[PDB]
Amino acid sequence: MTVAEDKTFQYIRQHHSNFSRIHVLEILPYLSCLTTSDQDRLRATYERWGNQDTLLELFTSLRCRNGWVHSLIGALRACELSGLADEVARIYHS
C-alpha cells in the first residue's frame, strides 16, 4: 500500500465505532474493487459470522485490492454514510 492508503486504513481502525454502523450486505455490491469471488466469499462470511466480524474481514480484504479507498468512498455515499466518505477522502489527501 501507499502512504495515503496506510494512513486511511489506520483512521478506519481508529474510528471503529463510526465504521461499525456499516451494513455489510448493503455495501458489498458498491465495492467495485472486489471481485465477484471476493463478494461471494464475503457474503458467506456474513451469513456465518454476522455483520461485526465480517466488517473486520471486509476492511483487511479491501486493502489487498487496488484503489480500495476510492471504492470505499463511493460505496459509503451509496449507503447513506456520505459523512464517513468525506472523512475518508480528507484523510487520504491529508
Side-chain angles (χ1 to χ4, degrees), residues 1-79 81-94:
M1 57 204 314
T2 66
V3 178
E5 292 173 320
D6 175 68
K7 205 193 293 193
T8 300
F9 192 76
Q10 304 314 321
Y11 176 80
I12 294 161
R13 262 196 187 214
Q14 286 164 4
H15 295 250
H16 180 73
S17 62
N18 303 82
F19 289 85
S20 77
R21 244 92 74 168
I22 288 162
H23 184 192
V24 171
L25 300 185
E26 190 175 326
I27 203 185
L28 283 180
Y30 298 100
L31 289 165
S32 57
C33 66
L34 302 166
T35 62
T36 59
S37 165
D38 286 350
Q39 275 179 234
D40 290 350
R41 182 173 67 81
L42 287 170
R43 264 184 287 277
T45 298
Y46 180 90
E47 174 155 280
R48 178 166 194 181
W49 287 286
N51 196 75
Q52 289 312 312
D53 292 345
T54 302
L55 259 185
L56 304 177
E57 181 54 28
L58 177 58
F59 290 125
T60 54
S61 290
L62 281 168
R63 72 166 168 178
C64 291
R65 294 295 184 260
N66 198 100
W68 67 269
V69 167
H70 306 298
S71 205
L72 178 64
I73 290 167
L76 289 166
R77 288 166 175 165
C79 287
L81 287 170
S82 284
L84 295 185
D86 287 343
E87 290 305 286
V88 169
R90 181 196 54 94
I91 292 288
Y92 180 86
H93 289 289
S94 63

Coordinates of all heavy atoms in Angstrom, one line a residue, unseen atoms left out:
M1 N 0.8 -1.2 0.0 CA 0.0 0.0 0.0 C 0.8 1.3 0.0 O 2.0 1.3 0.4 CB -1.0 0.0 1.2 CG -0.4 -0.2 2.5 SD -1.6 -0.8 3.7 CE -3.1 0.2 3.4
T2 N 0.2 2.4 -0.5 CA 0.8 3.7 -0.4 C 0.7 4.3 1.0 O 0.0 3.8 1.9 CB 0.1 4.7 -1.4 OG1 -1.2 4.9 -1.0 CG2 0.1 4.2 -2.8
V3 N 1.5 5.4 1.2 CA 1.4 6.1 2.5 C 0.0 6.6 2.7 O -0.5 6.4 3.8 CB 2.4 7.4 2.4 CG1 2.3 8.2 3.7 CG2 3.9 6.9 2.2
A4 N -0.6 7.1 1.7 CA -2.0 7.5 1.8 C -3.0 6.4 2.2 O -3.8 6.6 3.1 CB -2.5 8.1 0.5
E5 N -2.8 5.2 1.6 CA -3.7 4.1 1.9 C -3.5 3.6 3.4 O -4.5 3.4 4.1 CB -3.5 2.9 0.9 CG -3.9 3.3 -0.5 CD -3.5 2.2 -1.5 OE1 -2.4 1.7 -1.4 OE2 -4.3 1.9 -2.4
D6 N -2.3 3.5 3.8 CA -2.0 3.1 5.1 C -2.6 4.0 6.1 O -3.2 3.6 7.1 CB -0.5 2.9 5.3 CG -0.1 2.6 6.8 OD1 -0.4 1.5 7.3 OD2 0.5 3.5 7.5
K7 N -2.4 5.3 5.9 CA -2.9 6.4 6.7 C -4.4 6.3 6.8 O -5.0 6.5 7.9 CB -2.5 7.7 6.2 CG -2.4 8.8 7.2 CD -2.3 10.2 6.5 CE -0.9 10.3 5.7 NZ -0.7 11.8 5.3
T8 N -5.1 6.0 5.7 CA -6.5 5.9 5.6 C -7.0 4.6 6.4 O -7.9 4.6 7.1 CB -7.0 5.8 4.2 OG1 -6.7 7.0 3.5 CG2 -8.5 5.7 4.1
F9 N -6.2 3.5 6.2 CA -6.6 2.3 6.9 C -6.5 2.5 8.4 O -7.4 2.0 9.2 CB -5.6 1.2 6.5 CG -6.1 -0.2 6.9 CD1 -7.2 -0.8 6.3 CD2 -5.5 -0.8 8.0 CE1 -7.6 -2.1 6.7 CE2 -6.0 -2.1 8.4 CZ -7.0 -2.7 7.7
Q10 N -5.5 3.2 8.9 CA -5.4 3.4 10.3 C -6.5 4.3 10.9 O -7.0 4.1 12.0 CB -4.0 4.0 10.7 CG -2.8 3.1 10.2 CD -3.0 1.6 10.5 OE1 -3.5 1.2 11.6 NE2 -2.5 0.8 9.6
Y11 N -6.9 5.4 10.1 CA -8.0 6.2 10.5 C -9.2 5.3 10.7 O -9.9 5.4 11.8 CB -8.3 7.2 9.4 CG -9.6 8.0 9.7 CD1 -9.5 9.1 10.6 CD2 -10.8 7.7 9.1 CE1 -10.6 9.9 10.9 CE2 -11.9 8.5 9.4 CZ -11.8 9.6 10.3 OH -13.0 10.3 10.6
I12 N -9.5 4.4 9.8 CA -10.6 3.5 9.9 C -10.5 2.6 11.1 O -11.6 2.4 11.8 CB -10.7 2.6 8.6 CG1 -11.0 3.5 7.4 CG2 -11.8 1.5 8.8 CD1 -10.7 2.9 6.1
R13 N -9.4 2.0 11.4 CA -9.2 1.2 12.6 C -9.4 2.0 13.9 O -9.8 1.5 14.9 CB -7.7 0.7 12.6 CG -7.5 -0.7 12.1 CD -6.2 -1.2 12.6 NE -5.8 -2.5 12.0 CZ -5.1 -3.4 12.6 NH1 -4.6 -3.2 13.9 NH2 -4.8 -4.5 12.0
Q14 N -9.1 3.3 13.8 CA -9.1 4.1 15.0 C -10.5 4.6 15.2 O -10.8 5.0 16.4 CB -8.1 5.3 14.9 CG -6.7 4.8 15.1 CD -5.6 5.8 14.6 OE1 -6.0 6.9 14.2 NE2 -4.4 5.4 14.6
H15 N -11.4 4.6 14.2 CA -12.8 5.1 14.3 C -13.7 3.9 14.2 O -14.7 4.0 13.4 CB -13.1 6.2 13.4 CG -12.3 7.4 13.6 ND1 -12.9 8.6 14.1 CD2 -11.0 7.7 13.5 CE1 -12.0 9.5 14.3 NE2 -10.8 9.0 13.9
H16 N -13.4 2.8 14.9 CA -14.1 1.5 14.8 C -15.6 1.8 15.0 O -16.4 1.2 14.2 CB -13.6 0.6 15.9 CG -14.3 -0.8 15.9 ND1 -14.1 -1.7 15.0 CD2 -15.3 -1.3 16.8 CE1 -14.9 -2.8 15.2 NE2 -15.6 -2.5 16.3
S17 N -16.0 2.5 16.0 CA -17.4 2.7 16.4 C -18.1 3.5 15.2 O -19.3 3.2 15.0 CB -17.5 3.5 17.7 OG -16.9 4.7 17.7
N18 N -17.5 4.4 14.6 CA -18.2 5.0 13.4 C -18.5 4.1 12.3 O -19.6 3.9 11.8 CB -17.5 6.3 12.9 CG -17.3 7.3 14.0 OD1 -16.3 7.2 14.8 ND2 -18.1 8.3 14.0
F19 N -17.4 3.3 12.0 CA -17.5 2.4 10.8 C -18.3 1.2 11.1 O -18.7 0.5 10.1 CB -16.1 2.1 10.3 CG -15.4 3.3 9.6 CD1 -14.7 4.2 10.3 CD2 -15.6 3.5 8.2 CE1 -14.2 5.3 9.7 CE2 -15.0 4.6 7.6 CZ -14.3 5.5 8.3
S20 N -18.5 0.9 12.4 CA -19.3 -0.3 12.7 C -20.8 -0.2 12.4 O -21.5 -1.2 12.4 CB -19.1 -0.6 14.2 OG -19.9 0.3 15.0
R21 N -21.2 1.0 12.0 CA -22.5 1.3 11.6 C -22.8 0.7 10.2 O -24.0 0.6 9.8 CB -22.8 2.8 11.6 CG -23.8 3.3 12.6 CD -23.3 3.6 13.9 NE -22.6 4.9 13.9 CZ -22.2 5.6 15.0 NH1 -22.4 5.1 16.2 NH2 -21.5 6.7 14.9
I22 N -21.7 0.4 9.4 CA -21.9 -0.1 8.1 C -22.6 -1.5 8.1 O -22.3 -2.4 8.9 CB -20.5 -0.3 7.4 CG1 -19.9 1.0 7.0 CG2 -20.6 -1.2 6.2 CD1 -18.4 1.0 6.8
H23 N -23.6 -1.6 7.2 CA -24.2 -2.9 7.0 C -23.5 -3.6 5.8 O -23.6 -3.3 4.7 CB -25.7 -2.8 6.7 CG -26.4 -4.1 6.5 ND1 -27.7 -4.3 6.0 CD2 -26.0 -5.4 6.8 CE1 -28.0 -5.6 6.0 NE2 -27.0 -6.3 6.5
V24 N -22.8 -4.7 6.2 CA -22.0 -5.5 5.2 C -22.7 -5.8 3.9 O -22.2 -5.5 2.8 CB -21.4 -6.8 5.8 CG1 -20.9 -7.7 4.7 CG2 -20.4 -6.5 6.9
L25 N -23.9 -6.4 3.9 CA -24.6 -6.8 2.7 C -25.0 -5.6 1.8 O -25.1 -5.7 0.6 CB -25.9 -7.6 3.1 CG -25.7 -8.9 3.8 CD1 -27.0 -9.7 4.0 CD2 -24.6 -9.8 3.1
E26 N -25.3 -4.5 2.5 CA -25.7 -3.3 1.8 C -24.6 -2.6 1.0 O -24.7 -2.2 -0.1 CB -26.2 -2.3 2.9 CG -27.0 -1.1 2.3 CD -27.6 -0.2 3.5 OE1 -28.0 -0.8 4.5 OE2 -27.6 1.0 3.4
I27 N -23.4 -2.7 1.6 CA -22.2 -2.0 1.0 C -21.5 -2.8 -0.1 O -21.0 -2.3 -1.1 CB -21.2 -1.5 2.1 CG1 -20.4 -0.4 1.6 CG2 -20.4 -2.7 2.7 CD1 -19.3 0.1 2.6
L28 N -21.5 -4.2 0.0 CA -20.8 -5.1 -0.9 C -21.0 -4.8 -2.4 O -20.0 -4.7 -3.1 CB -21.1 -6.5 -0.6 CG -20.3 -7.1 0.6 CD1 -20.7 -8.6 0.8 CD2 -18.8 -7.0 0.3
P29 N -22.2 -4.7 -2.9 CA -22.4 -4.5 -4.3 C -21.9 -3.2 -4.9 O -21.7 -3.0 -6.1 CB -24.0 -4.5 -4.5 CG -24.5 -5.1 -3.2 CD -23.5 -4.7 -2.1
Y30 N -21.5 -2.3 -4.0 CA -20.9 -1.0 -4.4 C -19.4 -1.0 -4.4 O -18.8 -0.1 -5.0 CB -21.5 0.2 -3.6 CG -23.0 0.4 -3.7 CD1 -23.8 -0.1 -2.7 CD2 -23.5 1.0 -4.8 CE1 -25.2 0.0 -2.9 CE2 -24.9 1.1 -5.0 CZ -25.7 0.6 -4.0 OH -27.1 0.8 -4.1
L31 N -18.8 -2.0 -3.8 CA -17.4 -2.0 -3.7 C -16.7 -2.7 -5.0 O -16.4 -3.9 -5.0 CB -16.9 -2.7 -2.4 CG -17.2 -2.0 -1.1 CD1 -17.0 -2.9 0.1 CD2 -16.3 -0.7 -1.0
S32 N -16.5 -1.8 -6.0 CA -16.1 -2.3 -7.3 C -14.7 -2.9 -7.3 O -14.3 -3.6 -8.3 CB -16.3 -1.2 -8.3 OG -15.5 -0.1 -8.0
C33 N -13.9 -2.6 -6.3 CA -12.6 -3.2 -6.2 C -12.6 -4.7 -5.8 O -11.5 -5.3 -6.0 CB -11.7 -2.4 -5.2 SG -12.3 -2.5 -3.5
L34 N -13.7 -5.1 -5.3 CA -13.8 -6.6 -5.0 C -14.2 -7.4 -6.3 O -15.0 -6.9 -7.1 CB -14.8 -6.8 -3.9 CG -14.6 -6.1 -2.6 CD1 -15.8 -6.2 -1.7 CD2 -13.4 -6.7 -1.8
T35 N -13.6 -8.6 -6.4 CA -14.0 -9.5 -7.5 C -15.3 -10.1 -7.0 O -15.7 -10.1 -5.9 CB -13.0 -10.5 -7.8 OG1 -12.8 -11.4 -6.6 CG2 -11.7 -9.9 -8.2
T36 N -16.0 -10.7 -8.0 CA -17.2 -11.5 -7.7 C -17.0 -12.6 -6.8 O -17.8 -13.0 -6.0 CB -17.9 -12.0 -9.0 OG1 -17.0 -12.8 -9.7 CG2 -18.2 -10.8 -9.9
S37 N -15.8 -13.2 -6.9 CA -15.3 -14.2 -6.0 C -15.2 -13.7 -4.5 O -15.6 -14.3 -3.6 CB -14.0 -14.9 -6.4 OG -13.4 -15.6 -5.4
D38 N -14.5 -12.5 -4.5 CA -14.4 -11.8 -3.2 C -15.8 -11.5 -2.6 O -16.0 -11.7 -1.4 CB -13.7 -10.4 -3.4 CG -12.2 -10.5 -3.7 OD1 -11.7 -11.6 -3.5 OD2 -11.6 -9.5 -4.0
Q39 N -16.8 -11.1 -3.4 CA -18.1 -10.8 -2.9 C -18.8 -12.1 -2.4 O -19.5 -12.1 -1.4 CB -18.9 -10.0 -3.9 CG -18.7 -8.5 -3.8 CD -19.5 -7.7 -4.9 OE1 -18.9 -6.9 -5.6 NE2 -20.8 -7.9 -4.9
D40 N -18.6 -13.2 -3.2 CA -19.2 -14.5 -2.8 C -18.7 -14.9 -1.4 O -19.4 -15.3 -0.5 CB -18.9 -15.6 -3.8 CG -19.7 -15.4 -5.1 OD1 -20.6 -14.5 -5.2 OD2 -19.4 -16.1 -6.1
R41 N -17.3 -14.8 -1.3 CA -16.7 -15.2 0.0 C -17.2 -14.3 1.1 O -17.4 -14.8 2.2 CB -15.1 -15.0 -0.2 CG -14.4 -15.4 1.1 CD -12.9 -15.4 0.9 NE -12.4 -14.0 0.6 CZ -12.1 -13.2 1.6 NH1 -12.3 -13.5 2.9 NH2 -11.7 -12.0 1.3
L42 N -17.4 -13.1 0.9 CA -17.7 -12.2 2.0 C -19.2 -12.3 2.4 O -19.5 -12.3 3.6 CB -17.4 -10.7 1.6 CG -15.8 -10.5 1.6 CD1 -15.4 -9.1 1.1 CD2 -15.3 -10.6 3.1
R43 N -20.1 -12.6 1.4 CA -21.5 -12.9 1.8 C -21.6 -14.2 2.6 O -22.3 -14.2 3.6 CB -22.3 -13.1 0.5 CG -23.1 -11.8 0.1 CD -24.0 -12.1 -1.1 NE -23.2 -12.2 -2.3 CZ -22.8 -11.1 -3.0 NH1 -23.0 -9.9 -2.6 NH2 -22.1 -11.3 -4.1
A44 N -20.9 -15.2 2.2 CA -20.9 -16.5 3.0 C -20.3 -16.2 4.4 O -20.6 -16.9 5.4 CB -20.1 -17.6 2.3
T45 N -19.3 -15.3 4.5 CA -18.7 -14.9 5.7 C -19.7 -14.2 6.6 O -19.8 -14.5 7.8 CB -17.5 -14.0 5.5 OG1 -16.5 -14.7 4.7 CG2 -16.9 -13.5 6.8
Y46 N -20.5 -13.3 6.1 CA -21.5 -12.6 6.8 C -22.5 -13.6 7.3 O -22.9 -13.6 8.5 CB -22.2 -11.6 5.8 CG -23.4 -10.9 6.5 CD1 -23.2 -9.7 7.2 CD2 -24.7 -11.4 6.5 CE1 -24.2 -9.0 7.7 CE2 -25.7 -10.7 7.1 CZ -25.5 -9.5 7.7 OH -26.5 -8.8 8.3
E47 N -23.0 -14.5 6.5 CA -24.0 -15.5 6.9 C -23.6 -16.2 8.2 O -24.4 -16.4 9.1 CB -24.4 -16.4 5.8 CG -25.3 -17.5 6.2 CD -26.1 -18.1 5.0 OE1 -27.1 -17.5 4.6 OE2 -25.7 -19.2 4.5
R48 N -22.4 -16.6 8.2 CA -21.8 -17.4 9.3 C -21.5 -16.6 10.6 O -21.8 -16.9 11.7 CB -20.6 -18.2 8.9 CG -20.0 -19.0 9.9 CD -19.0 -20.0 9.3 NE -18.6 -21.1 10.2 CZ -17.8 -22.0 9.9 NH1 -17.2 -22.1 8.7 NH2 -17.4 -22.9 10.8
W49 N -20.8 -15.5 10.3 CA -20.2 -14.7 11.5 C -20.9 -13.4 11.8 O -20.5 -12.7 12.8 CB -18.7 -14.5 11.2 CG -17.9 -15.7 11.4 CD1 -17.6 -16.4 12.6 CD2 -17.3 -16.5 10.4 NE1 -16.8 -17.5 12.3 CE2 -16.6 -17.6 11.0 CE3 -17.3 -16.5 9.0 CZ2 -16.0 -18.6 10.3 CZ3 -16.6 -17.4 8.2 CH2 -16.0 -18.5 8.9
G50 N -21.8 -13.0 11.0 CA -22.6 -11.8 11.3 C -21.8 -10.5 10.8 O -20.7 -10.5 10.4
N51 N -22.5 -9.4 11.0 CA -22.0 -8.1 10.5 C -20.7 -7.6 11.1 O -19.8 -7.2 10.3 CB -23.1 -7.0 10.7 CG -22.8 -5.8 9.8 OD1 -23.0 -5.8 8.6 ND2 -22.3 -4.7 10.5
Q52 N -20.5 -7.6 12.4 CA -19.3 -7.0 13.0 C -18.0 -7.8 12.6 O -17.1 -7.2 12.2 CB -19.4 -6.9 14.5 CG -20.4 -5.8 14.9 CD -20.2 -4.5 14.2 OE1 -19.1 -4.0 14.1 NE2 -21.3 -3.9 13.6
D53 N -18.0 -9.1 12.8 CA -16.8 -9.9 12.5 C -16.5 -9.8 11.0 O -15.4 -9.8 10.5 CB -17.0 -11.3 12.9 CG -16.9 -11.5 14.4 OD1 -16.5 -10.5 15.1 OD2 -17.3 -12.6 14.9
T54 N -17.6 -9.7 10.1 CA -17.4 -9.6 8.7 C -16.8 -8.3 8.3 O -16.1 -8.1 7.3 CB -18.6 -10.0 8.0 OG1 -19.1 -11.3 8.4 CG2 -18.4 -10.0 6.4
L55 N -17.2 -7.2 9.0 CA -16.7 -5.9 8.7 C -15.2 -5.9 8.8 O -14.5 -5.4 7.9 CB -17.3 -4.9 9.7 CG -18.4 -4.0 9.1 CD1 -18.8 -3.0 10.2 CD2 -17.9 -3.3 7.8
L56 N -14.7 -6.5 9.9 CA -13.2 -6.6 10.1 C -12.6 -7.3 8.9 O -11.6 -6.8 8.4 CB -13.0 -7.4 11.4 CG -13.6 -6.8 12.6 CD1 -13.5 -7.6 13.9 CD2 -13.1 -5.3 12.8
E57 N -13.1 -8.5 8.6 CA -12.7 -9.2 7.4 C -12.8 -8.4 6.1 O -11.9 -8.5 5.2 CB -13.5 -10.5 7.3 CG -13.1 -11.4 6.1 CD -11.6 -11.7 6.1 OE1 -10.9 -11.7 7.2 OE2 -11.0 -11.9 5.0
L58 N -13.9 -7.6 6.0 CA -14.1 -6.8 4.8 C -12.9 -5.7 4.7 O -12.4 -5.5 3.6 CB -15.4 -6.1 4.9 CG -15.7 -5.1 3.7 CD1 -15.6 -5.8 2.4 CD2 -17.1 -4.5 3.9
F59 N -12.6 -5.0 5.7 CA -11.5 -4.0 5.6 C -10.2 -4.6 5.3 O -9.5 -4.0 4.4 CB -11.5 -3.1 6.9 CG -12.6 -2.2 7.0 CD1 -13.4 -2.2 8.2 CD2 -13.0 -1.3 6.0 CE1 -14.5 -1.3 8.3 CE2 -14.0 -0.4 6.1 CZ -14.8 -0.4 7.3
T60 N -9.8 -5.7 5.9 CA -8.5 -6.3 5.6 C -8.5 -6.9 4.2 O -7.4 -6.9 3.6 CB -8.0 -7.4 6.7 OG1 -9.0 -8.4 6.9 CG2 -7.7 -6.7 8.0
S61 N -9.6 -7.3 3.7 CA -9.7 -7.8 2.3 C -9.6 -6.6 1.4 O -9.0 -6.7 0.3 CB -11.1 -8.4 2.1 OG -11.1 -9.7 2.7
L62 N -10.2 -5.4 1.7 CA -10.2 -4.3 0.9 C -8.8 -3.8 0.5 O -8.5 -3.6 -0.6 CB -11.1 -3.2 1.4 CG -12.6 -3.3 1.3 CD1 -13.4 -2.3 2.1 CD2 -13.0 -3.1 -0.2
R63 N -8.0 -3.7 1.6 CA -6.7 -3.1 1.4 C -5.7 -4.0 0.6 O -4.6 -3.5 0.2 CB -6.0 -2.7 2.7 CG -5.6 -3.8 3.5 CD -4.7 -3.4 4.7 NE -4.5 -4.6 5.6 CZ -3.7 -4.5 6.7 NH1 -3.0 -3.4 7.0 NH2 -3.6 -5.6 7.4
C64 N -6.1 -5.2 0.4 CA -5.4 -6.1 -0.6 C -5.8 -5.8 -2.0 O -5.3 -6.4 -2.9 CB -5.6 -7.5 -0.3 SG -4.8 -8.0 1.3
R65 N -6.7 -4.8 -2.2 CA -7.2 -4.5 -3.5 C -6.9 -3.2 -4.0 O -7.1 -2.2 -3.3 CB -8.7 -4.7 -3.5 CG -9.2 -6.2 -3.3 CD -8.7 -7.1 -4.4 NE -9.2 -8.4 -4.2 CZ -8.4 -9.4 -3.8 NH1 -7.2 -9.2 -3.4 NH2 -8.9 -10.7 -3.7
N66 N -6.5 -3.1 -5.3 CA -6.2 -1.8 -5.9 C -7.3 -0.8 -5.8 O -8.4 -1.1 -6.2 CB -5.9 -2.1 -7.4 CG -5.1 -1.0 -8.1 OD1 -3.9 -1.1 -8.3 ND2 -5.8 0.0 -8.5
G67 N -6.9 0.4 -5.3 CA -7.8 1.5 -5.3 C -9.0 1.4 -4.4 O -10.1 2.0 -4.6
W68 N -8.8 0.7 -3.3 CA -9.9 0.4 -2.4 C -10.5 1.6 -1.7 O -11.6 1.7 -1.3 CB -9.5 -0.7 -1.4 CG -8.4 -0.2 -0.4 CD1 -7.1 -0.3 -0.6 CD2 -8.6 0.5 0.8 NE1 -6.4 0.2 0.5 CE2 -7.3 0.7 1.4 CE3 -9.7 0.9 1.5 CZ2 -7.1 1.3 2.6 CZ3 -9.5 1.5 2.8 CH2 -8.2 1.7 3.3
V69 N -9.6 2.6 -1.5 CA -10.0 3.8 -0.7 C -11.1 4.5 -1.5 O -12.2 4.9 -0.9 CB -8.8 4.8 -0.5 CG1 -9.3 6.1 0.0 CG2 -7.9 4.2 0.6
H70 N -11.0 4.7 -2.8 CA -12.0 5.3 -3.6 C -13.2 4.5 -3.8 O -14.3 5.0 -3.9 CB -11.4 5.7 -5.0 CG -10.1 6.5 -4.8 ND1 -10.2 7.8 -4.2 CD2 -8.8 6.3 -5.1 CE1 -8.9 8.2 -4.2 NE2 -8.1 7.4 -4.7
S71 N -13.0 3.1 -3.8 CA -14.1 2.2 -3.9 C -14.9 2.3 -2.6 O -16.2 2.4 -2.7 CB -13.5 0.8 -4.0 OG -14.5 0.0 -4.7
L72 N -14.3 2.5 -1.5 CA -14.9 2.6 -0.2 C -15.7 4.0 -0.1 O -16.8 4.0 0.4 CB -13.9 2.5 0.9 CG -14.5 2.6 2.3 CD1 -15.5 1.5 2.6 CD2 -13.4 2.7 3.4
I73 N -15.1 5.0 -0.7 CA -15.7 6.4 -0.6 C -17.0 6.4 -1.4 O -18.0 6.9 -0.9 CB -14.7 7.4 -1.1 CG1 -13.6 7.7 -0.2 CG2 -15.5 8.8 -1.4 CD1 -12.4 8.5 -0.8
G74 N -16.9 5.8 -2.6 CA -18.1 5.7 -3.4 C -19.2 4.9 -2.8 O -20.4 5.3 -2.8
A75 N -18.9 3.8 -2.2 CA -19.8 2.9 -1.5 C -20.5 3.5 -0.3 O -21.7 3.3 -0.1 CB -19.1 1.5 -1.2
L76 N -19.7 4.2 0.5 CA -20.2 4.8 1.7 C -21.3 5.8 1.3 O -22.3 6.0 2.0 CB -19.1 5.5 2.5 CG -18.2 4.5 3.1 CD1 -16.9 5.1 3.6 CD2 -19.0 3.8 4.3
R77 N -21.1 6.6 0.2 CA -22.1 7.5 -0.3 C -23.4 6.8 -0.7 O -24.5 7.3 -0.5 CB -21.5 8.3 -1.4 CG -20.5 9.3 -1.0 CD -19.7 9.9 -2.2 NE -18.8 10.9 -1.8 CZ -17.7 11.4 -2.5 NH1 -17.5 10.8 -3.7 NH2 -17.0 12.3 -2.1
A78 N -23.2 5.7 -1.3 CA -24.3 4.9 -1.8 C -25.1 4.2 -0.6 O -26.2 3.8 -0.8 CB -23.9 3.8 -2.7
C79 N -24.4 4.2 0.5 CA -25.1 3.5 1.7 C -25.4 4.5 2.8 O -25.4 4.2 4.0 CB -24.1 2.5 2.3 SG -24.0 1.0 1.3
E80 N -25.7 5.8 2.3 CA -26.2 6.8 3.2 C -25.2 7.1 4.4 O -25.6 7.3 5.5 CB -27.6 6.4 3.8
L81 N -23.9 7.0 4.1 CA -22.8 7.3 5.0 C -21.9 8.3 4.4 O -20.7 8.2 4.5 CB -22.1 6.0 5.5 CG -22.9 5.1 6.4 CD1 -22.2 3.7 6.7 CD2 -23.1 5.8 7.8
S82 N -22.4 9.3 3.7 CA -21.7 10.3 3.0 C -20.7 11.1 3.8 O -19.7 11.6 3.4 CB -22.6 11.2 2.1 OG -23.0 10.5 1.0
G83 N -21.0 11.2 5.1 CA -20.1 11.9 6.1 C -18.9 11.1 6.3 O -17.8 11.7 6.4
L84 N -19.0 9.8 6.5 CA -17.8 8.9 6.6 C -17.0 9.0 5.3 O -15.7 9.0 5.4 CB -18.1 7.5 6.9 CG -18.8 7.1 8.2 CD1 -19.0 5.6 8.4 CD2 -18.0 7.7 9.4
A85 N -17.6 8.9 4.2 CA -17.0 9.1 2.9 C -16.1 10.4 2.9 O -15.0 10.3 2.4 CB -18.0 9.1 1.8
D86 N -16.7 11.5 3.3 CA -16.0 12.7 3.3 C -14.8 12.7 4.2 O -13.8 13.4 3.9 CB -16.9 13.9 3.7 CG -17.8 14.2 2.5 OD1 -17.6 13.8 1.4 OD2 -18.9 14.9 2.8
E87 N -14.8 12.0 5.4 CA -13.7 12.0 6.3 C -12.6 11.1 5.7 O -11.4 11.4 5.8 CB -14.1 11.5 7.7 CG -14.9 12.5 8.5 CD -14.2 13.8 8.6 OE1 -13.3 13.9 9.4 OE2 -14.7 14.8 7.9
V88 N -13.0 10.0 5.1 CA -12.1 9.1 4.5 C -11.3 9.8 3.4 O -10.1 9.7 3.3 CB -12.8 7.8 3.9 CG1 -11.8 6.9 3.1 CG2 -13.3 7.0 5.1
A89 N -12.0 10.5 2.5 CA -11.4 11.3 1.5 C -10.4 12.3 2.0 O -9.3 12.4 1.5 CB -12.4 12.0 0.6
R90 N -10.7 13.0 3.1 CA -9.9 14.1 3.7 C -8.6 13.5 4.3 O -7.5 14.0 4.1 CB -10.7 14.9 4.7 CG -9.9 16.0 5.4 CD -10.6 16.5 6.7 NE -10.8 15.4 7.6 CZ -10.0 15.0 8.6 NH1 -8.9 15.6 8.8 NH2 -10.4 14.0 9.4
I91 N -8.7 12.3 4.9 CA -7.6 11.7 5.5 C -6.6 11.2 4.4 O -5.4 11.5 4.4 CB -8.0 10.4 6.3 CG1 -8.7 10.9 7.6 CG2 -6.7 9.6 6.7 CD1 -7.7 11.5 8.6
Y92 N -7.2 10.6 3.3 CA -6.4 10.1 2.2 C -5.6 11.2 1.5 O -4.5 10.9 1.1 CB -7.4 9.5 1.2 CG -6.7 8.9 0.0 CD1 -6.2 7.6 -0.1 CD2 -6.6 9.7 -1.2 CE1 -5.5 7.1 -1.2 CE2 -6.0 9.2 -2.3 CZ -5.4 7.9 -2.3 OH -4.8 7.4 -3.4
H93 N -6.1 12.4 1.5 CA -5.4 13.5 0.8 C -4.6 14.4 1.9 O -4.1 15.4 1.5 CB -6.4 14.4 0.1 CG -6.9 13.8 -1.2 ND1 -6.2 13.6 -2.3 CD2 -8.2 13.4 -1.5 CE1 -6.9 13.1 -3.2 NE2 -8.2 13.0 -2.8
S94 N -4.6 14.0 3.1 CA -4.1 14.9 4.2 C -2.5 15.0 4.2 O -1.8 14.1 3.8 CB -4.6 14.5 5.5 OG -4.2 13.2 5.9

